[PDB]
Copies of this chain bind each other. A is one copy, B any other.
């Protein structure tokens, strides 16, 4: 009749084999290997690095959850769900579940949540020896993979941010923590007379240059490698913070906003774009954001924030909330000017 069984509900929540069965199978590329059709375990185990027995058993669980079909014993075919796990797929989940990549690799922190509760700080260092940014920097290939994954998210959100802000009284925009520059590229091409500056890590900006630095919009952008905890390049009236504040704890997220305020001068405008948490939660939107927030606590030192917490940071960095809007999709867009 209805969904009233508290015991069953608890069984849904406590499963930890399924999420790591899932991640592992994506890492070993089984969605790709079965995309064509039914494949028996001997074959799937050979191509990936796997023991046939173990893989049979891991796929059996995931087949009980509808990720794979098993029409006979030890043969596994594709489903609507496995389509979404393929590299092939337009909006693929692969970069977020692949343990080769840095994003899913950070989910190994889940086992250290107790220490995270004791110290109130991140546990990426406890899992891997160094905290997230340090070891993404010491392993460039991991850093490149991080940047490529983030570029997939940015690419979806770009056209919306470009439209979502007013660019009339803006002559030079700085994308601070802008990744490969997917958002800035859109802003500039949408507004032919804008100057741009991509500020990020050196190999990140350089990979961004290769991608679109030759294009019409690329010509009107300086690709400036560096750190946004230091002083920023001068002469930007607008600074753009698209999904960077939630990576950082309160003192560090503050320091970024200070450097952005410093960079834009008085009556300069710092433009923030995040998904913000909302007190009286809701269904799938708020639950997903609360999950993501624990990823921020464990991997990074960060946090998803409400509008009012964002306001407490802006006030301590000589800024004030001007115009809060929202993209027809849920991404909120806040413009901040200077005080006095």
Which A residues are closer than 8 A to B by beta carbons? 1-3, 5-24, 27-28, 48-51, 53-55, 57-58, 60-61, 63-67, 70, 73, 79-81, 83-85, 91, 93, 96-97, 99, 107-108, 110-111, 113-114, 116-120, 279, 281, 284, 286-288, 290-291, 293-295, 297-298, 303
**Chain B residues with Cβ under 8 A from A12's Cβ?**
12
Q: How far is the CA of A295 from the CA of B15 in the complex (A)?
A: 10
A285 to chain B, nearest CB (A): 10
Closest to A5 in B: B80
**CB distance A17 to B291 under 8 Å?**
yes
**Chain B residues with Cβ under 8 A from A13's Cβ?**
18-19, 22, 65, 67, 81
**CB distance A6 to B79 under 8 Å?**
yes
The answer to whether A57 and B293 touch (CB under 8 A), given A8-B284, A111-B110, A114-B24, is: yes
Closest to A18 in B: B13
The answer to whether A19 and B27 touch (CB under 8 A), given A60-B293, A119-B51, is: no
**CB distance B297 to A57 under 8 Å?**
yes
Q: List 16 A-B contacts (CB under 8 A).
A: A6-B81, A7-B91, A9-B81, A12-B12, A13-B19, A13-B65, A18-B291, A20-B110, A21-B294, A51-B120, A54-B116, A57-B290, A64-B281, A64-B290, A73-B279, A108-B111
Q: How far is the CA of A287 from the CA of B23 in the complex (A)?
A: 17
Q: How many copies does the complex hold?
A: 2
**CB distance B14 to A22 under 8 Å?**
yes
A64 to chain B, nearest CB (A): 4
Q: How far is the CA of A64 from the CA of B290 in the complex (A)?
A: 8
**Chain B residues with Cβ under 8 A from A287's Cβ?**
61, 64-65
With contacts A14-B96, A20-B111, A73-B279 known, what are 17 further pairs, Cβ within 8 A?
Answer: A2-B80, A5-B80, A7-B84, A10-B85, A13-B67, A16-B16, A16-B107, A28-B114, A28-B117, A55-B117, A57-B290, A58-B117, A61-B290, A63-B281, A70-B281, A108-B111, A111-B111
CB contact between A294 and one of B58, B108, B111, B284 (< 8 Å): that residue: B58
The answer to whether A80 and B19 touch (CB under 8 A), given A54-B116, A99-B114, A288-B11, is: no
**Chain B residues with Cβ under 8 A from A290's Cβ?**
17, 57, 60-61, 63-64
Closest to A60 in B: B290
**Chain B residues with Cβ under 8 A from A28's Cβ?**
114, 117
Identify whether the interface residues of A are mostly helix, strand, loop, or mixed: helix
**Chain B residues with Cβ under 8 A from A91's Cβ?**
7
**CB distance A118 to B50 under 8 Å?**
yes
The answer to whether A10 and B93 touch (CB under 8 A), given A110-B111, A281-B63, is: yes
**CB distance A14 to B9 under 8 Å?**
no
Closest to A53 in B: B120
A89 to chain B, nearest CB (A): 10
**CB distance B54 to A17 under 8 Å?**
no
Of listed A64, A65, A81, A284, residue having the most chain B CB within 10 A:
A64
A78 to chain B, nearest CB (A): 11
Q: How far is the CA of A12 from the CA of B20 in the complex (A)?
A: 13
Q: How far is the CA of A20 from the CA of B13 in the complex (A)?
A: 9
**CB distance A117 to B49 under 8 Å?**
yes
**CB distance A117 to B80 under 8 Å?**
no
Q: How far is the CA of A79 from the CA of B2 in the complex (A)?
A: 9
